[PDB]
């Protein structure tokens with residue numbers, strides 16, 4: 271997260287860190303008792319850290335789960351950010367409590383109002399040098415209408431109806447925030463894309479996958495256990 275602030279500890283109990291060999295790689299979002307949603311290129315030794323604020327310090331709520339199965343969206347492709355979703359089935363159902371709870375996710379396939387203030391959280395890089403934070407960061411970002419996001423000087427027609435944008439003027443998602451939650455009105459709306467992109471430039475808005483657009487996919491995979 272560029273231009274953000276340290277989040278309140280445990281105030282986002284749905285927040286996951288998706289890890290490879292005990293190192294943070296992507297954000298994730300607990301969406302069912304045994305399932306974490308993240309982004310497709312995150313998988314390209316997989317564990318999921320729940321109940322955390324600090325990646326390194328002991329916390330009573332923190333628990334690192336093994337992953338039984340990793341299910342990247344079957345239409346996802348290395349060179350694109352289309353269909354950029356990943357579901358991770360934990361080795362067991364997560365132990366729930368005030369610091370570990372799933373997030374309700376949007377099933378109405380219609381756009382949020384332009385300007386809606388959404389929260390994005392993560393352990394991604396925090397400056398141009400690539401500094402990695404030990405504790406969870408967040409930022410409040412206004413949603414940016416699709417027509418502007420698609421203008422020639424911005425993302426030039428790459429924004430489908432299955433993607434949404436937020437403003438990226440100094441406050442932004444960046445590397446390592448991939449897979450994490452864009453939350454609007456207490457509901458999961460988007461997931462941070464995992465394609466490389468310039469961070470913090472107003473002319474290059476943040477891109478997030480619209481979970482409502484993938485409701486059939488998520489329902490099926492969540493039911494496949």
Ligand SMILES: NC(=O)n1cc(NC(=O)N2C[C@H](F)C[C@H]2C(=O)Nc2cccc(OC(F)(F)F)c2)c2ccccc21
Nearest residue numbers: 295311312394395402443444445446448463464466467
């Ligand atoms: N949406 C958004 O703006 N971006 C998303 C990016 N992609 C990303 O993040 N990925 C790709 C994989 F899914 C693995 C993952 C990754 O690199 N993870 C990674 C690798 C090394 C360290 C790390 O931890 C760190 F703390 F640094 F973030 C994460 C990205 C890269 C550069 C700039 C913008 C970026």
